Design a protein around this nucleic acid. Structure first.
Ligand SMILES: [Zn+2]
Lengths: 49, 177, 76, 83, 141, 117
RNA sequence: UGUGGUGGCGAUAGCGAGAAGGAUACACCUGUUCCCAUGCCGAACACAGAAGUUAAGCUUCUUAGCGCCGAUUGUAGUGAAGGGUUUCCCUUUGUGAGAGUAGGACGUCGCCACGC
RNA sequence: GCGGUCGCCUCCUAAAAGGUAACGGAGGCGCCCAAAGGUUCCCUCAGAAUGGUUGGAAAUCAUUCGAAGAGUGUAAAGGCA
RNA sequence: UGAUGGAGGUAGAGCACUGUUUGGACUAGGGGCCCAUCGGGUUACCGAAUUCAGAUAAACUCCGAAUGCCAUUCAUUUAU
């Protein structure tokens, strides 16, 4: 079921974070508001495609 | 309404007569009316509560809830979180108007005419006086109701012993046998 | 024909400094699993219920009436 | 009263087939005939067949010539033959 | 191979115990009783034999009191099996008795038949006994 | 039915507030006390246990009844008596209550009249 | 000095039982228009008021029925010396519990305000 | 030799700091949850007795007694009102 | 070595918790069966509501020792 996953900054285009999900409870892609170390500002992060 | 007027006029000084109360605050009032359509068959088909709520909304002036389960019973096919029954509380002045409907209309429209059974004691001022049918009230539609289940009424007073509640219900209609 | 012979390692709990010491900042005092002794003055709790000393000083032990005990640090 | 999710009610004055008690309230409705000032200015149409005096738990023993339809359905056709 | 009395399990194998001394634990039901004044294990079957040697002198009356019960269990391996592997299957139900404690008690029968039945009992138990009354109380009644 | 008391619940709420911070060394408490007809307040240090300044509703100078306005007057009195003894950064007790009325009436009247939160 | 608020100290502070009170204060009670609220219900929660009642809560006083705190003394257990069977027991020397009790005990200390 | 076992976590053996072996005595693990996480508010359980239509020892109710006899994703300890 | 404060649940007691248990009082009510084809439920065992007395535990505890262990701007002797 579960999958080790990585996040993607939607502005600076980097692979920043790493976390988990359960791919039958969450069919669509994750979106959380996290902190980007490159831009030093809170930025939306999507799942890496 | 009628029944606060009876408390102000006749009920309270007759209570001070028949129990020798030293102050008016000692007099027992009435608090609640609790109603419970205990269906227990929405687990089989869920469209059984779907008309029990329709009947309770007409009978009361409120809507009922839907009750949870707290257990998991194998015999009746029960788990946690199961829709079973439906409470209706009553407070304020809708206590007394519903009691007016109970004293006047309802209680004399039941076959095997006897009124009120005198043993509902519980020692502490609570007469759960259940209802067998559903067709008793004036607002009941033969073209809508099918099942022949019934109601619950939990009369709740602040009286200590049941000698007091008998005299209160004697001074509030309530045709005991 | 035995299905036993399994253990965990020993993980070495217990108080790691006595009373009356001179105790530097941020050192462990009484490692627990499960809160057996609550903290008092200048003592905090980590993730696995251990007990520090925030300020430099002297560890002394107390008790909360009847049930459970306290650790507190007085500078000085 | 929580808003919008409670049923319909108007303080409807009672009546009766016999002697017409006019004091009370109600919830259901109809075509209003006697909006009455001495009571709630509402419907009269709750017109119950029962006085709670007509039943012999309050007034006394009054059913010998009780003369009600289905009662007379036997007790008029041979009821003239009875008496 | 007659076992009268057992337990309900909750643990199969138990550690072989270590008994040193006791005291008190006097007559209170019941009027005439033994005292085991050494210390040993006492099995099931000895208490059967003690029962029957009691009751065949207790004809039409007189109470029998059994105050000791086999809680613990021994184990034993086979013959031909070496040392080695796990503890063998438990066979038997045996309870320890130290000094001081009282094996059995009698009441309702005069003294002579009492001492008859008690010496019939104590030749079937591996402990040196005595015979003691309910001697003195604050109220004997 | 036992009618339940209405200070046992308030003091259970005090006990589950006062675990975190009283902390009244020189940044003391405030207080908020409902009744049916009054509003009281105190400024308390620990571990002296000794108050510093206070005011109350129907004792001294009133405006209305069980109003917010009386509470604003009380907050004016508390903040003016406090700053005559050099106190800046008091800590609220919530008491056992909420912030809807009769309480924020004390609070934001006490803020503007000298105090700091 | 009464009452209310508010703190520490191991329930010796408690639980049960009984009596008394409304100067102020507290509380019950009246009601919902308004801030606000009920998975339904002004029961609470929130806000307006003040006809009355000390019945309840609260406060004061009595009480050793349940619970709490209990000395001294006797014994089991045991460090260090020793002696016999060696499974176990006994003797000198140091330390002593757990039970079972005489007994203590129906609180103590601190601050602010109001009324008197 | 044939059997069984090989890493990790709990309890006992373990001699009241910690540590301590046996093919000694008992059980689990190779995950799960986008909320079962963070904060801010509010709340108190299992049972028993007595009455009440379907309704039955055991559903929804109502009053009273009830320091825990409950719950804590999962084995066992230590905690938590 | 002496003085002082503290951590802990061994020995022994081991009842209040959970397991194992022995006799007496009792019905709320069960009996193969009754008095039967409405009340006495003859006798019977009595578990639970209970409640007296009496025992037991390595994986039971309301309690609880000598001793060892860790510490000290402490004291005496010693020299690590
Ligand atoms: Zn970026």
């Amino acid at each position: 079921m579960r999958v080790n996953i990585t996040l993607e900054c939607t502005s600076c285009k980097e692979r920043n974070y790493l976390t988990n999900k359960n791919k039958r409870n969450n069919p669509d892609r994750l979106e959380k508001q996290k902190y980007c170390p490159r831009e030093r500002k809170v930025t939306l992060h999507r799942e890496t495609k | 309404n009628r029944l606060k007027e009876k408390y102000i006029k006749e009920v309270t000084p007759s209570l001070v007569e028949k129990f020798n109360y030293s102050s008016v605050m000692q007099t027992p009032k009435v608090d609640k009316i609790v109603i419970n359509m205990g269906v227990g068959d929405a687990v089989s088909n869920a469209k059984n509560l779907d008309k029990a709520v329709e009947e309770l909304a007409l009978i009361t002036g409120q809507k009922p809830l839907i009750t949870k389960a707290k257990k998991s019973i194998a015999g009746f096919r029960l788990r946690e979180g199961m829709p079973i029954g439906a409470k209706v509380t009553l407070r304020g002045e809708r206590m007394y108007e519903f009691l007016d409907k109970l004293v006047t209309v309802s209680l004399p429209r039941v076959r095997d005419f006897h009124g009120v059974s005198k043993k509902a004691f519980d020692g502490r001022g609570n007469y759960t006086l259940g209802i067998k049918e559903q067709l008793i009230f004036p607002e009941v539609d033969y073209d809508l109701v099918d099942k022949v289940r019934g109601m619950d009424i939990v009369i709740v007073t602040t009286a200590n012993t049941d000698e007091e509640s008998r005299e209160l219900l004697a001074q509030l209609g309530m045709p005991f046998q | 024909s035995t299905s036993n012979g399994r253990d965990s390692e020993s993980k070495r709990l217990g108080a790691k400094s006595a009373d009356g010491q001179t105790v530097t900042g941020g050192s462990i005092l009484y490692r627990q699993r499960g809160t057996k002794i609550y903290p008092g003055v200048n003592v905090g709790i980590g993730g696995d219920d251990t007990l520090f000393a925030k300020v430099d000083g002297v560890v002394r032990f107390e008790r909360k009436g009847r049930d459970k005990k306290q650790v507190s640090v007085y500078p000085v | 009263m929580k808003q919008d999710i409670h049923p319909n009610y108007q303080p409807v004055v009672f009546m009766d087939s016999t002697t017409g008690f006019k004091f009370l309230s109600g919830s259901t409705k109809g075509s209003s005939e006697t909006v009455e000032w001495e009571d709630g200015n509402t419907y009269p149409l709750l017109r119950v067949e029962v006085t709670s005096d007509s039943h012999p738990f309050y007034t006394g023993r009054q059913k010998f010539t009780q003369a009600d339809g289905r009662v007379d359905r036997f007790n008029k056709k041979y009821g003239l033959k009875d008496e | 191979m007659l076992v009268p009395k057992r337990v309900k399990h909750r643990r199969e194998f138990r550690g072989k115990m270590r008994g040193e001394a006791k005291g008190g634990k006097e007559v209170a039901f019941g009027e005439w009783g033994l005292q085991a004044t050494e210390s040993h294990w006492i099995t099931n079957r000895q208490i059967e034999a003690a029962r029957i040697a009691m009751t065949r002198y207790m004809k039409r009356g007189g109470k029998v009191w059994i105050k000791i019960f086999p809680h613990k269990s021994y184990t034993s391996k086979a013959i031909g099996v070496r040392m080695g592997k796990g503890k063998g299957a438990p066979e038997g139900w045996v309870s320890p008795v130290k000094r001081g404690k009282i094996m059995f008690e009698i009441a309702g029968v005069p003294e002579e038949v009492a001492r008859e039945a008690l010496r019939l009992a104590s030749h079937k138990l591996p402990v040196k006994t005595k015979i003691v009354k309910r001697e003195e109380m604050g109220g004997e009644s | 039915i036992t009618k339940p008391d209405k200070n046992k619940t308030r003091q259970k709420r005090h006990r589950r507030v006062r675990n975190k911070i009283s902390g009244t060394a020189e940044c003391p408490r405030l207080n908020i006390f409902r009744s049916n007809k009054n509003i009281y307040a105190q400024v308390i240090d620990d571990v002296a246990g000794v108050t510093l300044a206070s005011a109350s509703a129907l004792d001294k100078e009133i405006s209305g009844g069980t109003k917010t306005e009386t509470a604003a007057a009380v907050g004016k009195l508390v903040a003016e008596r406090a700053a005559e003894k050099g106190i800046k950064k008091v800590v609220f007790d919530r008491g056992g209550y909420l912030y809807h009325g009769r309480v924020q009436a004390l609070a934001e009247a006490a803020r503007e009249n000298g105090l700091e939160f």
